[PDB]
Design a protein around this ligand. Structure first.
Ligand SMILES: CC(C)=CCC/C(C)=C/COP(=O)(O)OP(=O)(O)O
Ligand SMILES: CC(C)=CCC/C(C)=C/COP(=O)(O)OP(=O)(O)O
Ligand SMILES: CC(C)=CCC/C(C)=C/COP(=O)(O)OP(=O)(O)O
Ligand SMILES: [Mg+2]
Ligand SMILES: [Mg+2]
Ligand SMILES: [Mn+2]
Ligand SMILES: [Mn+2]
Lengths: 327, 344
């Protein structure tokens, strides 16, 4: 993203904190509002805000050039921060399920941070025609993300992976509901609504390509968890018994002997068991299978983007595609 | 509540479960929608649904008599179930946070096989679900956005209450310097009074197309006063109630809760009595709970509660008489009549 784009986006964050914790209200509960300021400051604005900045870029590429005022680009930035509040709530839920001090999280902090995005939406968007579509989008994406988290959990029982559950159909459903809706659909649909693009067929056209990009994003992430260079963090998907693309394709390709290695060694704490699974992935040619998928999926997605109709700009989707595939 | 009111309200619940789990959506993930039906069935419909039924009663007393149709009373019932969905989400999370054993005689959801900390996802899922119910039944009505905004605002405020409650503890040990009547009043207001008292009445007002900010303000003032008495009565009965009639053995002392009893005990205590609270309050040993209970008796908290109950009843009744605009006084007298001198 541009130096200008990053600086104007980051400049919004302190306002959102004041809006949620000060707002010149002279609160009767300053101790807990000061704590909530720290929860927001310590968890929301740090590292890459790729979903938030992607909301701004989406809007800038969908809106009429004449309507790209500083005021409208700032509203796009505020929507991006609502996406980052959602992201923060989900990472807090992950931190809590993993497991006072600086960086302490309360169990209800994830519910509280999630709820806060609706206060931001009400403050800035309640008088604009895009308001109800935007709040309904957040409601629907929230519900779908929760269903994705539950589907992922239904691949584990008594701390053991249920390998009978590791199908490509279930995997595709987990990625779609748990990740693709809030990561890929939400930023683009927000940009479209702020640009007063309400046509359901336009949103459906964007959705089809964004779910395809989302699936490759997660498959690449899964591949690199096992086969990536740590010095470019250490992957724990095998140890944690995750429903990974690697595990799903391993089970498709496995003979009975190879399947029994997965049953015995997948989702075990012992480092030796991780190396046994990695050795099986190498034997089954999962790297070559990933290489073929990467090429074939790139070509199909590029084709669908070139074919994008309903008055949608293809360059927006190419920018996203190029970002994920690193063309 | 009438036999009719209870049965018509209960008839709505299975429709809401179908709306959220069997309405032709998410056909690729039936195992999730089937599980979510079980989450709703366990956590939402087995209580007294006092907040849900109170939404219907509020609406019936606020709406113009000639406007009360079976169709509009059903919409009030659906809003009542949305309150019960919010409450279910909050209590799923609170039971995990407090590591509680039971809730309304049922094992806490987080204790059920293969849930534990996944109760966090179920909490967020149940809370998110009420906005899908609002969309289906209210999207075409003027009250739609005010009701959405009220639910999100009450969720935010309830979280401020829960987090303020947590700031009365340091790593599972009560901070007795934090146990002031000011902090107690703030915890009750934010953590329980907004969702329990303000939310049902404000929903009734919005469905009756009552949007006057001053009406909502006057309603809030009296409902926060009633809400404080209700929680003080609840706190008193945790220690001094009969387990067989309350339907629960009280563990507030064991849990180190910022209860009205603990707050008033500290106000009334000499330094020796303060030392007993410092040493024994919030301890797991049954002997420590008995020592605190015995100190509450020594300090005359039963007599103190009886005086508070009579004085606060009189003060709130006076305030309801002074309510202006066109708010029905009878709504607030009906709440008081239900609440005052209760033993459960
Ligand atoms: C709509 C879009 C494009 C959203 C995707 C958000 C996302 C997590 C991308 C990863 O890129 P990154 O630059 O944050 O990560 P890395 O440094 O690993 O490439
Ligand atoms: C606006 C009004 C008057 C709301 C009703 C408040 C109330 C008395 C709740 C009691 O709930 P409960 O202890 O019966 O619990 P539950 O209904 O959850 O079982
Ligand atoms: C944001 C969240 C999760 C809010 C929880 C709200 C609530 C009503 C908790 C119960 O309070 P308690 O723990 O003091 O009482 P009990 O469990 O005894 O009902
Ligand atoms: Mg990963
Ligand atoms: Mg109690
Ligand atoms: Mn509790
Ligand atoms: Mn609690």
């Amino acid at each position: 993203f541009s130096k200008e784009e990053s600086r104007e986006f980051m400049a919004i964050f302190p306002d959102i904190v004041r809006d949620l914790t000060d707002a010149g209200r002279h609160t009767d509960i300053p101790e807990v509002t000061k704590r909530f300021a720290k929860v927001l400051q310590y968890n929301v604005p740090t590292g890459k805000k790729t979903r938030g900045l992607s909301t701004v870029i989406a809007y800038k590429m969908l809106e009429k050039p004449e309507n790209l005022t500083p005021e409208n680009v700032r509203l796009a930035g505020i929507l991006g921060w609502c996406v980052e509040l959602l992201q923060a709530s989900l990472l807090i839920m992950d931190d809590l399920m993993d497991r006072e001090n600086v960086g302490f999280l309360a169990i209800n902090d994830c519910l509280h941070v999630e709820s806060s995005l609706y206060s931001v939406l009400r403050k800035y968007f309640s008088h604009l025609p895009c308001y109800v579509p935007i709040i309904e989008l957040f409601h629907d994406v929230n519900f779908k993300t929760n269903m994705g988290q539950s589907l992922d959990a239904l691949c584990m029982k008594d701390g053991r992976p249920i390998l009978s559950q590791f199908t490509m159909k279930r995997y595709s459903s987990i990625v779609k509901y748990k990740t693709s809706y809030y990561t890929f659909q939400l930023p683009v649909s927000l940009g479209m609504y702020l640009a007063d693009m309400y046509d359901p067929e336009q949103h459906r056209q964007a959705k089809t390509i964004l779910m395809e990009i989302g699936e490759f994003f997660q498959i690449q992430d899964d591949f690199l968890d096992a086969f990536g260079d740590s010095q470019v963090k250490v992957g724990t998907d095998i140890k944690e018994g995750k429903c990974s693309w690697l595990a799903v394709v391993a089970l498709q390709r496995s003979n009975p002997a190879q399947r029994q290695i997965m049953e015995e060694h997948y989702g075990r704490p012992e480092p030796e068991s991780t190396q046994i699974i990695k050795n099986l992935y190498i034997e089954l040619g999962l790297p070559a299978t990933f290489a073929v998928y990467e090429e074939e999926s790139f070509n199909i997605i590029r084709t669908h983007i070139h074919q994008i109709s309903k008055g949608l700009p293809h360059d927006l989707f190419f920018k996203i595609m190029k970002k994920i595939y690193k063309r």
